[PDB]
Scaffold this active site. Structure first.
Site, short mmCIF file in Angstrom:
data_model
loop_
_atom_site.label_atom_id
_atom_site.label_comp_id
_atom_site.label_asym_id
_atom_site.label_seq_id
_atom_site.Cartn_x
_atom_site.Cartn_y
_atom_site.Cartn_z
N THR A 23 -6.75 6.36 7.55
CA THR A 23 -7.15 6.67 6.18
C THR A 23 -7.11 5.44 5.27
OG1 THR A 23 -4.99 7.26 5.41
CG2 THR A 23 -6.33 9.07 6.38
N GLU A 47 -3.46 13.37 1.25
CA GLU A 47 -4.76 12.90 1.73
C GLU A 47 -5.55 14.10 2.22
OE1 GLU A 47 -3.93 9.26 4.11
OE2 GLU A 47 -4.71 8.48 2.20
N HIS A 84 1.94 8.94 1.60
CA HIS A 84 0.98 8.81 0.52
C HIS A 84 1.42 9.77 -0.56
CE1 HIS A 84 -1.81 6.74 3.32
NE2 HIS A 84 -1.20 7.49 4.19
N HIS A 101 2.96 10.68 7.25
CA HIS A 101 2.20 10.38 8.46
C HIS A 101 3.14 9.73 9.46
CE1 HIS A 101 -1.80 10.27 6.09
NE2 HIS A 101 -1.38 11.50 6.42
N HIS A 130 5.00 6.62 7.32
CA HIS A 130 4.84 6.19 5.94
C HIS A 130 4.35 7.41 5.20
CE1 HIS A 130 0.89 5.94 7.86
NE2 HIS A 130 0.46 6.39 6.63
N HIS A 185 0.82 -1.20 0.00
CA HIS A 185 0.00 0.00 0.00
C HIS A 185 0.86 1.26 0.00
CE1 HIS A 185 -3.31 -2.77 0.42
NE2 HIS A 185 -2.78 -3.24 1.57
N1 LIG Z 1 -2.75 6.52 6.97
S1 LIG Z 1 -2.91 6.54 8.57
O1 LIG Z 1 -1.77 7.19 9.18
O2 LIG Z 1 -4.24 6.95 8.95
C1 LIG Z 1 -2.87 4.85 9.21
C2 LIG Z 1 -2.08 4.48 10.30
F1 LIG Z 1 -1.24 5.36 10.91
C3 LIG Z 1 -2.12 3.15 10.74
F2 LIG Z 1 -1.30 2.93 11.77
C4 LIG Z 1 -2.94 2.18 10.18
S2 LIG Z 1 -2.92 0.54 10.86
O3 LIG Z 1 -4.01 -0.19 10.23
O4 LIG Z 1 -3.29 0.71 12.34
C5 LIG Z 1 -1.42 -0.45 10.63
C6 LIG Z 1 -0.38 0.35 9.79
O5 LIG Z 1 -0.12 -0.07 8.44
C7 LIG Z 1 -3.73 2.55 9.11
F3 LIG Z 1 -4.60 1.70 8.54
C8 LIG Z 1 -3.69 3.86 8.66
F4 LIG Z 1 -4.52 4.20 7.65
ZN LIG Z 2 -1.18 7.41 6.21
#
Ligand SMILES: NS(=O)(=O)c1c(F)c(F)c(S(=O)(=O)CCO)c(F)c1F
Ligand SMILES: [Zn+2]
Length: 257
Positions: A195, A103, A93, A116, A91, A61
């Protein structure tokens, strides 16, 4: 499974994850004119001096740098947060073109990418349990625009060729995430969600106003990653962003102006 394509992208996620149509989904458009300056918000305390990165992986992803969060090292506190949140991973996007990829949006403006930095509330003991709580996670979001290079990002960019496909991982120690932060810690904050699936409504979002600049070469390297595993038809990992979701009954608060 879920992804970012025509047949499994954001508009399909609600079928497996009905909270996709929930009351506190992320990202959102930040309408800067409508955000409320809240003089009671604290400066954000970002304490990354003892961060210990471990590994970088391509999960099909995004790519993610994971940290050793087994001790109170790299922590976020203050701002809108009650208590101590510990950094577990970051990570990004990003887009297929420099005009999209973030995002969150600001007055409908899309940035080239969004970083993020994911933290979990220590009162819940571990990231997994924290993601089940309405105040479990705090994600620090930072926009990326294309211009001058970000020297602190280069170590990341240079290892991506070793994690090109889904499932690949590498050792990735001694990476300092302070080198990804802008000068100012002025921010917007609101209650939202992950997200990506499972889209849990567990996040306090803290989105910095000041973007960081990265070079066109650095973002080009992100776009060379693949969604697919090694051996499968090549699909470049680009446009791994969820569009803005309905704000519904939320206020976005500003730490400034
Ligand atoms: N993009 S985001 O920062 O909101 C985010 C996270 F930080 C996140 F930790 C998850 S998670 O599903 O909890 C496992 C990580 O791949 C996410 F699924 C996730 F979407
Ligand atoms: Zn993210």
């Amino acid at each position: 499974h879920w992804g970012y394509g025509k047949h499994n992208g954001p508009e399909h996620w609600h079928k497996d994850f009905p909270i996709a149509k929930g009351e506190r989904q992320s990202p959102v458009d930040i309408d800067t004119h409508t955000a409320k300056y809240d003089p009671s918000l604290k400066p954000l305390s970002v304490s990354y001096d003892q961060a210990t990165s471990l590994r970088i992986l391509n999960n099909g992803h995004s790519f993610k740098v994971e940290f050793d969060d087994s001790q109170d090292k790299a922590v976020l506190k203050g701002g809108p947060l009650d208590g101590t949140y510990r950094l577990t991973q970051f990570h990004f996007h990003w887009g297929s073109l420099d005009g999209q990829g973030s995002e969150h949006t600001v007055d409908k403006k899309k940035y080239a990418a969004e970083l993020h930095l994911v933290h979990w509330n220590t009162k819940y003991g571990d990231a997994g349990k924290a993601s089940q709580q309405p105040d479990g996670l705090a994600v620090l979001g930072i926009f990326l625009k294309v211009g001058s290079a970000k020297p602190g990002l280069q170590k990341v960019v240079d290892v991506l060729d070793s994690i090109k496909t889904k499932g690949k991982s590498a050792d990735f120690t001694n990476f300092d995430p302070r080198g990804l932060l802008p000068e100012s810690l002025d921010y917007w904050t609101y209650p939202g969600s992950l997200t990506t699936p499972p889209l849990n409504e567990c996040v306090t979002w803290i989105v910095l106003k000041e973007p960081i600049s990265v070079s066109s070469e650095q973002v080009l390297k992100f776009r060379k990653l693949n969604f697919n595993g090694e051996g499968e038809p090549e699909e470049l990992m680009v446009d791994n962003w969820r569009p803005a979701q309905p704000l519904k009954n939320r206020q976005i608060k500003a730490s400034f102006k």
